[PDB]
């Protein structure tokens, strides 16, 4: 059996620091494997064998442990870090894997650039009319959406989906969806898609009034 | 270059079968032990078998859950390995890998770039995909956000590009949500003002499943 854990489940880091993250065995092996994983792609080796470095991985990265207890360790912390790392052996059938631990990179607060859209035309005419709006390259990940049709707050039929950290900005993005038929649609006038963040205090909020064309 | 691609993934309802394959190319494909590993969705990494090289005799091992139902072999002229699923069931659905193993029990070196299997009774579905254009001439601060709304699919995923790929920057394309059996995602691109809409902004979507292929052009509206 033996189970891996791994600790923290979330890694905050400033590039330029110094991180190192733990695998522990709940039973003696006699090596640990890494692997790093962004989000859309297939894990890699990263680590072999406790401290060898896979092909191609930056010398800043650096791996250790014995027995029940590893780690890895990056010297100096680089955006393009963020990712999910695991930890794995082969011991006994089956070999396991840890949970992971996601290195979130550390950087200043960014407001939403939020961006509201009628349903399209299209859409409409087939009876179904969404409200789609975009609140992309923001920071931190934490965030609220309210939605408002003419001054009256409303949660039912939203639907969020929320990005990975970006690579390179290392910002978040979100789209919110509020789903209506054509009519419910047309009993209204303004429609609003709110944004509370750590950003401000007061809220974003972009809004649109219904015009039949 | 060690290179891993697997084909085959796809929706198939429960009880059924469907086998994956994984083209190896790079190294020779008969002295390396084989694996299959899938990551549910939310879940670990889980490991499923192997087979074994030509010293060892090309002995398989497969782990408890899929052991019986799941077979591992190599292609007897093409450089491919299979996985054979049979009597699947909605816990199986998930990303599947091929992944070589450096040497015996030791750790997976190098690996395919997954494929995906849904285990579903719901049905097949094409995407309706709606241009999102301001209902207003918007420009006040610079930049303009331009988006497409896929809504409505089944079985994951359909993929999205703006211009062909051309329109690489500023696009943010999001997670798909599932509702009552059906899937809706939504993409946005970011252009300056001059490329739009002087230059044609078009939202190009595929859904294999359906072999559907679609490509919206962002037209402004008022």
Same mark, same amino acid.
């Given at each position: 059996?033996?189970?891996?854990?791994?600790?923290?489940?979330?890694?905050?880091?400033?590039?330029?620091?110094?991180?190192?993250?733990?695998?522990?065995?709940?039973?003696?092996?006699?090596?640990?494997?890494?692997?790093?994983?962004?989000?859309?792609?297939?894990?890699?080796?990263?680590?072999?064998?406790?401290?060898?470095?896979?092909?191609?991985?930056?010398?800043?990265?650096?791996?250790?442990?014995?027995?029940?207890?590893?780690?890895?360790?990056?010297?100096?912390?680089?955006?393009?870090?963020?990712?999910?790392?695991?930890?794995?052996?082969?011991?006994?059938?089956?070999?396991?894997?840890?949970?992971?631990?996601?290195?979130?990179?550390?950087?200043?607060?960014?407001?939403?650039?939020?961006?509201?859209?009628?349903?399209?035309?299209?859409?409409?005419?087939?009876?179904?009319?969404?409200?789609?709006?975009?609140?992309?390259?923001?920071?931190?990940?934490?965030?609220?959406?309210?939605?408002?049709?003419?001054?009256?707050?409303?949660?039912?039929?939203?639907?969020?989906?929320?990005?990975?950290?970006?690579?390179?900005?290392?910002?978040?993005?979100?789209?919110?969806?509020?789903?209506?038929?054509?009519?419910?649609?047309?009993?209204?006038?303004?429609?609003?898609?709110?944004?509370?963040?750590?950003?401000?205090?007061?809220?974003?909020?972009?809004?649109?009034?219904?015009?039949?064309? | 270059?060690?290179?891993?691609?697997?084909?085959?993934?796809?929706?198939?309802?429960?009880?059924?079968? #469907? !086998?994956?394959?994984?083209?190896?190319? /790079?190294?020779?494909? &008969?002295?390396?032990?084989?694996?299959?590993?899938?990551? *549910? @969705?939310?879940?670990?990494?889980?490991?499923?078998?192997?087979?074994?090289?030509?010293?060892?005799?090309?002995?398989?091992?497969?782990?408890?859950?899929?052991?019986?139902?799941?077979?591992?072999?190599?292609?007897?002229?093409?450089?491919?390995?299979?996985?054979?699923?049979?009597?699947?069931?909605?816990?199986?659905?998930?990303?599947?890998?091929?992944?070589?193993?450096?040497? #015996? !029990?030791?750790?997976?070196?190098?690996? /395919?770039?997954?494929? &995906?299997?849904?285990?579903?009774?719901?049905?097949?579905? *094409? @995407?309706?995909?709606?241009?999102?254009?301001?209902?207003?001439?918007?420009?006040?601060?610079?930049?303009?956000?331009?988006?497409?709304?896929?809504?409505?699919?089944?079985?994951?995923?359909?993929?999205?590009?703006?211009?062909?790929?051309?329109?690489?920057?500023?696009?943010?394309?999001?997670?798909?949500?599932?509702?009552?059996?059906?899937?809706?995602?939504?993409?946005?691109?970011?252009?300056?003002?001059?490329?739009?809409?002087?230059?044609?902004? &078009?939202?190009?979507?595929?859904?294999?499943?359906?072999?559907?292929?679609?490509?919206?052009?962002?037209?402004?509206?008022?």
């Amino acid at each position: 059996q033996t189970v891996l854990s791994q600790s923290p489940a979330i890694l905050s880091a400033s590039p330029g620091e110094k991180v190192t993250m733990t695998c522990r065995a709940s039973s003696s092996v006699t090596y640990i494997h890494w692997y790093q994983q962004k989000p859309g792609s297939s894990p890699k080796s990263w680590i072999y064998a406790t401290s060898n470095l896979a092909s191609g991985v930056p010398a800043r990265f650096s791996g250790s442990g014995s027995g029940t207890s590893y780690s890895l360790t990056i010297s100096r912390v680089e955006a393009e870090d963020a990712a999910t790392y695991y930890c794995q052996h082969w011991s006994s059938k089956p070999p396991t894997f840890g949970g992971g631990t996601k290195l979130e990179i550390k950087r200043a607060d960014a407001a939403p650039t939020v961006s509201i859209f009628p349903p399209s035309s299209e859409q409409l005419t087939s009876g179904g009319a969404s409200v789609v709006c975009f609140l992309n390259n923001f920071y931190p990940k934490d965030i609220n959406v309210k939605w408002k049709i003419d001054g009256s707050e409303r949660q039912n039929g939203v639907l969020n989906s929320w990005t990975d950290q970006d690579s390179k900005d290392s910002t978040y993005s979100m789209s919110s969806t509020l789903t209506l038929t054509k009519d419910e649609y047309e009993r209204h006038n303004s429609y609003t898609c709110e944004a509370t963040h750590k950003t401000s205090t007061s809220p974003i909020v972009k809004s649109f009034n219904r015009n039949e064309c | 270059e060690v290179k891993l691609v697997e084909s085959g993934g796809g929706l198939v309802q429960p009880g059924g079968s #469907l !086998r994956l394959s994984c083209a190896t190319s /790079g190294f020779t494909f &008969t002295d390396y032990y084989m694996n299959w590993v899938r990551q *549910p @969705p939310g879940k670990a990494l889980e490991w499923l078998g192997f087979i074994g090289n030509k010293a060892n005799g090309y002995t398989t091992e497969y782990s408890a859950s899929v052991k019986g139902r799941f077979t591992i072999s190599r292609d007897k002229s093409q450089s491919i390995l299979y996985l054979q699923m049979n009597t699947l069931r909605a816990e199986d659905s998930a990303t599947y890998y091929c992944t070589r193993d450096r040497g #015996l !029990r030791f750790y997976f070196d190098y690996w /395919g770039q997954g494929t &995906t299997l849904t285990v579903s009774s719901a049905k097949t579905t *094409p @995407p309706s995909v709606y241009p999102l254009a301001p209902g207003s001439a918007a420009q006040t601060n610079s930049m303009v956000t331009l988006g497409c709304l896929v809504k409505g699919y089944f079985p994951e995923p359909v993929t999205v590009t703006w211009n062909s790929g051309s329109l690489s920057s500023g696009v943010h394309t999001f997670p798909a949500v599932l509702q009552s059996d059906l899937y809706t995602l939504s993409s946005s691109v970011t252009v300056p003002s001059s490329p739009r809409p002087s230059e044609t902004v &078009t939202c190009n979507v595929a859904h294999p499943a359906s072999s559907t292929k679609v490509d919206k052009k962002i037209v402004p509206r008022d």
